[PDB]
Amino acid sequence: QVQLQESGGGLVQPGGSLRLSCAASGRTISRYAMSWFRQAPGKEREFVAVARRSGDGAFYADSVQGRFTVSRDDAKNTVYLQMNSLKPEDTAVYYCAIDSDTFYSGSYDYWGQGTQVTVSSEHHH
Amino acid sequence: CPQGLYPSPASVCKPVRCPAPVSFENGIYTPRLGSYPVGGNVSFECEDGFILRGSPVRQCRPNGMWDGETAVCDNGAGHCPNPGISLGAVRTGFRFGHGDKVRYRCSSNLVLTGSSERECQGNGVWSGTEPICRQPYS
Amino acid sequence: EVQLVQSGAEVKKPGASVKVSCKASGYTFTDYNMDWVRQATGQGLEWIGDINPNYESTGYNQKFKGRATMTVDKSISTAYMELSSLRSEDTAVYYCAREDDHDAFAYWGQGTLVTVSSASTKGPSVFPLAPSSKSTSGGTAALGCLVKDYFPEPVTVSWNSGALTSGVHTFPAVLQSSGLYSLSSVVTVPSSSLGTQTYICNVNHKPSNTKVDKKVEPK
Amino acid sequence: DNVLTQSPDSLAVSLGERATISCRASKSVRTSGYNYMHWYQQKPGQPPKLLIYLASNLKSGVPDRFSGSGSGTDFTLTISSLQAEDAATYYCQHSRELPYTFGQGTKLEIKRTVAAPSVFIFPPSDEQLKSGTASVVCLLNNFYPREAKVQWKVDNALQSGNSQESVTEQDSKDSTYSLSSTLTLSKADYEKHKVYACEVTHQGLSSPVTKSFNR
Ligand SMILES: *[C@@H]1O[C@H](CO)[C@@H](O[C@@H]2O[C@H](CO)[C@@H](O[C@@H]3O[C@H](CO[C@H]4O[C@H](CO)[C@@H](O)[C@H](O)[C@@H]4O)[C@@H](O)[C@H](O)[C@@H]3O)[C@H](O)[C@H]2NC(C)=O)[C@H](O)[C@H]1NC(C)=O
Ligand SMILES: [Ca+2]
Ligand SMILES: [Cl-]
Ligand SMILES: [Cl-]
């Protein structure tokens, strides 16, 4: 029984940068891959990135390659998503999920509730 | 041919190679090759409970002969010391008590020099001289 | 320059013996030991033993328990490896390999497949994997051939006598509990071509001297 | 015997980037001023090829993007700038003592972006069915990374013990994998049931996807 909680969402202008966090409790996650997904309104949930175990690599969707970076702090039981060069189409709720399969087949059994990232010029001066 | 090469019969100038051990009982040697280039080195090591006598490291000379002295791993239990097997030679007889004997032959075109048979004498010394398998050239 | 050429693939029953040959050329045969190394499929490399042609003296990996015997015939520059009391775990590709002066394996033979099994040599049955609405995405359709119940490896599969190569995926064989192999080959093609273009998979199984051609069409 | 342990067991590297593979020996391979450790490359269907001898020396003809270092018990193979032809399995090997032994092998593949599989399914042919057996085939096409899970369901009951699967090597054009899973049943059991499904899990899927047909 793992609890995941994302933080870091907010309103950023296009071209801006933002870092999301996902903290886990109830289990040490160092043995498990952690993935980021996102869902914009009226669209399907989309894969963003996966951080496998330290030393096993990080892998990205085409749509975010080059702009987003996933990393992990196993001592803090946390994973991060650094987001650069944001576009309005990156607006979505961003979710973290744990892959419960240590062999990395994508058995996403536990999810966070998500954090809203909105990329707009609307509340920026 | 130039130094460090030997011809085909009479007179292809092929490189000289020094002979490998047929065996090295109760020890190992490195690198373990079928023959050794001029300038190459072979290093000998003994297993537990054995004394390494002779040269632990030997180099192959331009005339196809090893320098130093034949290495052997000796447990010291014989009346005579383990006489070893000089490189290029094959030996028969594996008892080193008083009166026992060993026989040596060379291999391929190697020319045996020294005593082809040696007996363990009363004073603990092997009779004769150590056989040495010399290259036919040089 | 230096070439090591091995004898062909072998199939043996458990308890039998196999003798693999390795003909050397391009160097003075007595300058170097000949070594033998094996590799099970999807597995690592295991050293078997070596022989010095000057003396016909040998060294062996103790794990083989005297089952391996190495010999040479200097007159024809050939080394032999004989492995007796064969088990199914001895199924592997066997290589002769020759050291350089650094005691690294600088030269290797092409490998010899030895298959150890109670199965008898048998050609495959070939069944279509027909395109349908369940194998279509966009304007493309996947179709294939199931090549089932053959022994030993290998089979070769081609499409339209080798005239179709793009989009082909031929999977590794799996060994079934019957002791016979099975594999599939699939290709992706335009859905519009299914009514006009014929697709045939050509299966060649050299151990049984069998060739099968199967037309694959929509149901 | 000397046990050689390589790490990682596999790794994905982008073209142009550095790849490093490690080999740790349980006993020192150093003696007489040399480290008796060698590295080989192996591609499918071919013998290994010697790249690096005595830890750090390039064999003639090997490109100089390859290098080796280390001493004693700890050794590394580095490719300074990975090229497509460098995808292969790498092996370390010692020649310090007998028996010669090899590392278990490190598979080096080309990294690309994640791609979820396209899932297809094929009923058994009528020809096979006449012979008494039914093979149902699930195809996962062009996905990345390689790891995936396929589960068979028959009239919504999960199956076990009656399927086998096989995966291709990385595709030379798009660097993806494909996988087939085959469910094998008797004709009699095949004709007792209606719905045949494969459920697919993959790290690029937010939930498992199911492909099915009705007999
Ligand atoms: C077996 O052990 C022997 C004893 O240790 C080894 O002998 C040594 O071999 C080295 C190398 O051959 C000799 O060094 C000399 O090197 C020069 C060339 O030097 C030029 O290149 C070097 C870099 O390689 C560079 O530092 C310089 O600036 C030079 O421009 C050669 O011309 C000589 O031939 C000589 O070889 C040592 O003198 C020698 N030591 C002894 C005590 O003889 C032998 O190499 C070992 N054999 C094997 C196969 O490992
Ligand atoms: Ca050797
Ligand atoms: Cl990593
Ligand atoms: Cl290069």
Q: How would you describe what is shown here?
A:
The complex is a heterotetramer of chains A (125), B (138), C (219) and D (215). With 138 residues, chain B is an all-beta fold. Chain B has strands spanning 5-7, 13-15, 17-19, 27-30, 35-37, 41-46, 51-53, 57-59, 72-74, 89-92, 101-106, 111-113, 117-119, 132-134. Chain B has a three-stranded antiparallel sheet with strand order 4-6-8, with no helix packed on it. A three-stranded antiparallel sheet of chain B has the order 10-11-13, with no helix packed on it. In chain B, strands 1-2 form a two-stranded antiparallel ribbon. Chain B is globular, with a radius of gyration of 16 Å. Chain B starts with a strand and ends with a strand. Chain C has strands at residues 3-6, 10-12, 18-25, 34-39, 45-52, 57-60, 68-73, 78-83, 92-99, 105-108, 112-116, 125-129, 136-137, 140-150, 156-159, 169-170, 174-175, 181-190, 200-205, 210-215. In chain C, strands 2, 4, 5, 6, 9, 10 and 11 form a seven-stranded mixed sheet that branches. In chain C, strands 12, 13, 14, 16, 17 and 18 form a six-stranded antiparallel sheet that branches. The N and C termini of chain C lie far apart (55 Å). With 215 residues, chain D is mostly beta strands. Chain D is built from two helices and 21 strands. Chain D has helices spanning 126-130, 187-190; strands at residues 4-7, 10-13, 19-25, 30-31, 34-35, 37-42, 49-53, 57-58, 66-71, 74-79, 88-94, 101-102, 106-110, 118-122, 133-143, 149-154, 157-158, 163-167, 177-186, 195-201, 209-214. Classes of the chains: A mainly beta (125), B mainly beta (138), C mainly beta (219), D mainly beta (215). Chains in contact: A-D, B-C, B-D, C-D. The structure holds a molecule of 4 linked components (NAG-NAG-BMA-MAN), calcium ion and chloride ion (2 copies). Chain B: Glycans are attached at residue 41. Chain B: This is Complement C2a. Chain B: Residues 16-75, 78-135 form the Sushi domain.
Radius of gyration of chain B: 16 Å
- Oligomeric status of the shown chains? heterotetramer
In the CATH classification, which architecture of chain B applies? Answer: Ribbon
User: What's the SSE pattern of chain D?
Assistant: EEEEEEEEEEEEEEHEEEEEHEE
**DSSP, total strands of chain D:** 21
List each distinct ligand once.
a molecule of 4 linked components (NAG-NAG-BMA-MAN), calcium ion, chloride ion
Any idea what the CATH superfamily of the largest domain in chain D is called?
Answer: Immunoglobulins
Count interface residues per chain for the largest interface.
C-D, 46 and 49 residues
Q: How many domains would you count in the coordinates of chain D?
A: 2
The number of distinct structural domains of chain B comes to 1
Disulfide bonds (chain B): 1-13, 18-60, 46-73, 80-120, 106-133
Glycosylation sites (chain B): 41
Organism (chain B): Homo sapiens (Human)
Domain Sushi (chain B): 16-75, 78-135
